[PDB]
């Protein structure tokens, strides 16, 4: 490609829990500047993900694009981290949502159901150049 | 088991980065006098200028300036580590410049378990 997202990034699917960032970067006046690029970051259950760590993960997800030099200004207040998996026991698909807060929430261990759950972050973020 | 959460009230027991920062504004007025923080680090890591910037920003979060961002780092900054060479029986000091390519954190195990990598700098910061 002309900008192949993935310097070295794993060629095969992740072997453990990961955070998937899919943000759309916008300016203040509501103009879309950057379309969502797929980016993965491994995470560990037991970790606490706060709003500040989320802000830094999205700034790092931009470094994978042409907007590598932008900083996060403001994260959509309604963003949440969602995870979807199939529960072995009940036999249904289930989805958990965690809100992005200052105190934060702890990464759950869903390994009993899936070894590599995908924690999804899909929002808009106002970004500005450094 | 990796290298510790919230960090010790005692001296670290692994390599660590000591951050000594003076925050000024775009006019060199001083906002924050020398402020010290410790971060555990792992030998084998490549420390780039950009990583250092993030560490100093994180160092600011424990101050009145947590909402500020690092705009520029003093170009004369350097990381220095001082230890006692166990073979030479003398004090030894290594300097690593801060550059875009960075440098790889050495393992000084043979001489010291918990070396402290010193970073003393002045940085321009501005509200986000």
Short mmCIF file of C-alpha atoms in Angstrom, two decimals:
data_model
loop_
_atom_site.label_atom_id
_atom_site.label_comp_id
_atom_site.label_asym_id
_atom_site.label_seq_id
_atom_site.Cartn_x
_atom_site.Cartn_y
_atom_site.Cartn_z
CA UNK A 1 0.00 0.00 0.00
CA UNK A 2 0.81 3.77 0.14
CA UNK A 3 0.54 3.88 3.95
CA UNK A 4 0.39 0.24 5.18
CA UNK A 5 -1.06 0.44 8.71
CA UNK A 6 1.17 -2.03 10.54
CA UNK A 7 4.95 -1.56 10.75
CA UNK A 8 5.46 -4.99 12.33
CA UNK A 9 2.03 -5.49 14.02
CA UNK A 10 1.17 -9.15 14.34
CA UNK A 11 0.26 -10.86 11.10
CA UNK A 12 -1.94 -13.42 12.93
CA UNK A 13 -4.85 -12.74 15.28
CA UNK A 14 -3.86 -11.80 18.87
CA UNK A 15 -3.19 -14.61 21.30
CA UNK A 16 -4.52 -12.73 24.39
CA UNK A 17 -6.86 -9.87 25.41
CA UNK A 18 -6.37 -6.73 23.37
CA UNK A 19 -7.77 -3.25 23.14
CA UNK A 20 -9.02 -2.23 19.71
CA UNK A 21 -9.14 1.48 18.98
CA UNK A 22 -11.40 2.71 16.22
CA UNK A 23 -11.67 6.44 16.49
CA UNK A 24 -12.84 9.06 14.14
CA UNK A 25 -10.87 12.28 14.55
CA UNK A 26 -12.79 15.51 14.24
CA UNK A 27 -12.05 19.22 14.70
CA UNK A 28 -14.08 21.50 16.89
CA UNK A 29 -16.50 22.78 14.20
CA UNK A 30 -17.57 19.20 13.55
CA UNK A 31 -15.56 18.20 10.49
CA UNK A 32 -14.24 14.67 10.13
CA UNK A 33 -10.45 14.76 9.77
CA UNK A 34 -9.41 11.14 10.02
CA UNK A 35 -11.32 7.97 9.41
CA UNK A 36 -11.10 5.06 11.88
CA UNK A 37 -7.90 2.93 11.43
CA UNK A 38 -7.65 -0.45 13.09
CA UNK A 39 -5.17 -0.55 15.87
CA UNK A 40 -4.47 -3.21 18.52
CA UNK A 41 -2.80 -2.95 21.91
CA UNK A 42 -2.37 -5.91 24.19
CA UNK A 43 -3.79 -5.55 27.71
CA UNK A 44 -3.90 -7.65 30.83
CA UNK A 45 -6.87 -8.48 33.05
CA UNK A 46 -6.27 -6.92 36.43
CA UNK A 47 -5.13 -3.64 34.77
CA UNK A 48 -7.11 -0.47 35.54
CA UNK A 49 -7.96 1.55 32.46
CA UNK A 50 -8.63 5.16 33.29
CA UNK A 51 -9.79 8.02 31.07
CA UNK A 52 -6.17 9.36 31.05
CA UNK A 53 -4.72 6.04 29.92
CA UNK A 54 -7.47 5.87 27.30
CA UNK A 55 -6.51 9.36 26.10
CA UNK A 56 -2.93 8.24 25.72
CA UNK A 57 -3.89 5.00 23.87
CA UNK A 58 -5.86 6.96 21.29
CA UNK A 59 -2.98 9.48 20.80
CA UNK A 60 -0.78 6.44 20.22
CA UNK A 61 -3.34 5.01 17.76
CA UNK A 62 -2.95 8.25 15.73
CA UNK A 63 0.83 7.75 15.50
CA UNK A 64 -0.03 4.85 13.18
CA UNK A 65 -1.59 7.31 10.70
CA UNK A 66 -0.75 10.48 8.83
CA UNK A 67 -2.00 12.38 11.88
CA UNK A 68 0.87 11.05 14.09
CA UNK A 69 1.63 14.62 15.14
CA UNK A 70 -1.83 15.40 16.61
CA UNK A 71 -2.75 15.37 20.29
CA UNK A 72 -6.05 14.38 21.80
CA UNK A 73 -8.09 17.46 22.88
CA UNK A 74 -11.37 15.98 24.00
CA UNK A 75 -12.77 12.45 23.99
CA UNK A 76 -16.48 12.06 23.33
CA UNK A 77 -17.99 11.99 26.85
CA UNK A 78 -20.41 9.23 25.80
CA UNK A 79 -17.65 6.76 24.70
CA UNK A 80 -17.52 3.34 26.26
CA UNK A 81 -15.42 0.23 25.99
CA UNK A 82 -17.51 -2.73 24.77
CA UNK A 83 -16.63 -6.37 24.64
CA UNK A 84 -18.57 -9.13 22.88
CA UNK A 85 -18.22 -12.84 23.31
CA UNK A 86 -20.13 -16.06 23.33
CA UNK A 87 -20.83 -17.48 26.75
CA UNK A 88 -20.09 -21.25 26.74
CA UNK A 89 -22.63 -21.94 29.56
CA UNK A 90 -25.76 -19.91 28.70
CA UNK A 91 -24.99 -20.43 25.00
CA UNK A 92 -25.77 -16.76 24.10
CA UNK A 93 -23.80 -13.86 22.84
CA UNK A 94 -23.26 -11.33 25.56
CA UNK A 95 -21.92 -7.77 25.53
CA UNK A 96 -20.46 -5.79 28.43
CA UNK A 97 -19.98 -2.02 28.47
CA UNK A 98 -17.64 -0.10 30.66
CA UNK A 99 -17.75 3.65 30.88
CA UNK A 100 -14.68 5.76 30.47
CA UNK A 101 -14.20 7.56 33.81
CA UNK A 102 -11.55 9.21 35.88
CA UNK A 103 -11.49 6.46 38.49
CA UNK A 104 -11.72 3.86 35.72
CA UNK A 105 -12.63 0.17 35.72
CA UNK A 106 -10.63 -3.03 35.98
CA UNK A 107 -10.13 -5.31 32.96
CA UNK A 108 -12.18 -8.46 33.52
CA UNK A 109 -10.87 -11.99 32.83
CA UNK A 110 -13.13 -13.59 30.18
CA UNK A 111 -10.60 -16.23 29.34
CA UNK A 112 -13.03 -18.93 30.49
CA UNK A 113 -15.00 -18.07 27.33
CA UNK A 114 -12.47 -16.71 24.87
CA UNK A 115 -8.70 -16.46 24.99
CA UNK A 116 -8.43 -13.33 23.03
CA UNK A 117 -11.36 -11.05 23.73
CA UNK A 118 -11.42 -7.75 21.89
CA UNK A 119 -12.14 -4.68 24.02
CA UNK A 120 -13.53 -2.13 21.57
CA UNK A 121 -13.17 1.59 21.71
CA UNK A 122 -15.29 3.25 18.99
CA UNK A 123 -15.81 7.05 19.31
CA UNK A 124 -15.04 10.47 18.01
CA UNK A 125 -12.28 12.52 19.48
CA UNK A 126 -11.51 16.19 18.95
CA UNK A 127 -7.82 16.35 18.02
CA UNK A 128 -5.47 19.34 17.40
CA UNK A 129 -1.88 19.51 16.01
CA UNK A 130 1.05 19.80 18.57
CA UNK B 1 5.31 -10.85 37.73
CA UNK B 2 6.76 -7.65 36.18
CA UNK B 3 8.07 -4.44 37.85
CA UNK B 4 5.57 -3.02 40.43
CA UNK B 5 2.38 -0.89 40.34
CA UNK B 6 1.94 2.42 42.22
CA UNK B 7 5.71 2.31 43.04
CA UNK B 8 7.48 1.94 46.41
CA UNK B 9 7.60 4.23 49.43
CA UNK B 10 11.19 2.87 49.76
CA UNK B 11 13.99 2.74 47.25
CA UNK B 12 13.16 0.82 44.08
CA UNK B 13 14.64 -2.68 43.74
CA UNK B 14 14.95 -2.55 39.97
CA UNK B 15 16.26 -0.01 37.37
CA UNK B 16 14.37 3.15 37.44
CA UNK B 17 14.22 6.49 35.78
CA UNK B 18 14.40 9.52 38.13
CA UNK B 19 12.70 12.50 36.60
CA UNK B 20 13.82 15.96 37.84
CA UNK B 21 11.81 18.57 36.03
CA UNK B 22 11.53 22.29 35.96
CA UNK B 23 8.48 23.51 34.02
CA UNK B 24 8.55 26.87 32.36
CA UNK B 25 6.21 28.70 30.01
CA UNK B 26 6.99 29.86 26.50
CA UNK B 27 8.79 32.82 28.12
CA UNK B 28 10.91 30.87 30.53
CA UNK B 29 8.97 32.08 33.55
CA UNK B 30 9.18 29.22 36.01
CA UNK B 31 5.93 27.49 36.87
CA UNK B 32 7.18 24.38 38.64
CA UNK B 33 10.43 24.24 40.53
CA UNK B 34 12.38 20.91 40.41
CA UNK B 35 9.86 18.13 40.87
CA UNK B 36 10.98 14.55 41.36
CA UNK B 37 9.30 11.30 40.37
CA UNK B 38 10.40 7.71 39.84
CA UNK B 39 9.31 5.31 37.12
CA UNK B 40 10.39 1.73 36.96
CA UNK B 41 12.09 0.79 33.70
CA UNK B 42 13.16 -2.42 32.08
CA UNK B 43 16.63 -2.99 30.64
CA UNK B 44 16.36 -3.61 26.91
CA UNK B 45 13.93 -0.75 26.29
CA UNK B 46 14.63 1.84 23.67
CA UNK B 47 14.16 5.31 25.19
CA UNK B 48 13.35 7.85 22.53
CA UNK B 49 12.87 11.60 22.79
CA UNK B 50 9.20 11.01 22.32
CA UNK B 51 9.02 8.48 25.16
CA UNK B 52 10.89 10.85 27.49
CA UNK B 53 8.30 13.56 26.63
CA UNK B 54 5.55 11.24 27.71
CA UNK B 55 7.31 10.38 30.93
CA UNK B 56 7.75 14.05 31.85
CA UNK B 57 4.06 14.73 31.06
CA UNK B 58 3.17 11.85 33.37
CA UNK B 59 5.56 13.32 35.94
CA UNK B 60 3.38 16.54 35.81
CA UNK B 61 0.20 14.72 36.68
CA UNK B 62 1.11 14.67 40.33
CA UNK B 63 1.20 18.53 40.36
CA UNK B 64 -0.97 21.60 39.81
CA UNK B 65 -0.03 21.20 36.15
CA UNK B 66 -1.49 17.80 35.36
CA UNK B 67 -3.70 19.36 32.69
CA UNK B 68 -0.65 20.78 30.89
CA UNK B 69 1.17 19.24 27.93
CA UNK B 70 4.90 19.09 27.13
CA UNK B 71 5.55 21.43 24.24
CA UNK B 72 9.39 21.32 24.02
CA UNK B 73 12.13 19.59 25.91
CA UNK B 74 15.50 21.33 26.56
CA UNK B 75 17.76 20.13 23.69
CA UNK B 76 20.75 19.86 26.05
CA UNK B 77 19.02 17.17 28.25
CA UNK B 78 20.79 13.89 28.86
CA UNK B 79 20.22 10.74 30.87
CA UNK B 80 23.07 9.92 33.19
CA UNK B 81 23.63 6.99 35.39
CA UNK B 82 26.23 6.70 38.09
CA UNK B 83 27.28 3.39 39.63
CA UNK B 84 30.28 1.76 41.26
CA UNK B 85 32.19 -0.60 38.97
CA UNK B 86 32.73 -3.78 40.96
CA UNK B 87 35.70 -4.83 38.80
CA UNK B 88 37.43 -1.41 38.72
CA UNK B 89 36.57 -0.34 42.28
CA UNK B 90 35.75 3.18 41.05
CA UNK B 91 32.78 5.45 40.30
CA UNK B 92 31.69 5.27 36.70
CA UNK B 93 29.20 7.54 34.82
CA UNK B 94 27.52 6.96 31.43
CA UNK B 95 25.64 9.58 29.46
CA UNK B 96 22.98 8.99 26.90
CA UNK B 97 21.75 11.86 24.77
CA UNK B 98 18.06 12.28 24.07
CA UNK B 99 17.55 11.89 20.32
CA UNK B 100 14.79 10.71 18.06
CA UNK B 101 16.39 7.29 17.53
CA UNK B 102 17.00 6.98 21.23
CA UNK B 103 19.22 4.49 23.02
CA UNK B 104 18.71 1.04 24.57
CA UNK B 105 18.67 0.89 28.34
CA UNK B 106 21.66 -1.14 29.43
CA UNK B 107 21.54 -3.92 31.98
CA UNK B 108 24.00 -2.95 34.73
CA UNK B 109 23.13 -6.03 36.77
CA UNK B 110 26.76 -7.09 37.20
CA UNK B 111 27.28 -3.87 39.21
CA UNK B 112 24.00 -2.66 40.66
CA UNK B 113 20.50 -4.16 40.97
CA UNK B 114 18.59 -0.88 41.05
CA UNK B 115 20.41 1.75 39.12
CA UNK B 116 18.85 5.18 38.93
CA UNK B 117 18.84 6.79 35.49
CA UNK B 118 18.85 10.48 36.03
CA UNK B 119 17.00 12.90 33.86
CA UNK B 120 17.34 16.57 34.87
CA UNK B 121 15.61 19.00 32.44
CA UNK B 122 13.66 22.07 31.90
CA UNK B 123 10.58 21.83 29.68
CA UNK B 124 8.14 24.23 28.14
CA UNK B 125 4.61 23.29 29.02
CA UNK B 126 1.29 24.89 28.11
CA UNK B 127 -2.32 24.10 29.13
CA UNK B 128 -4.01 21.47 26.91
#
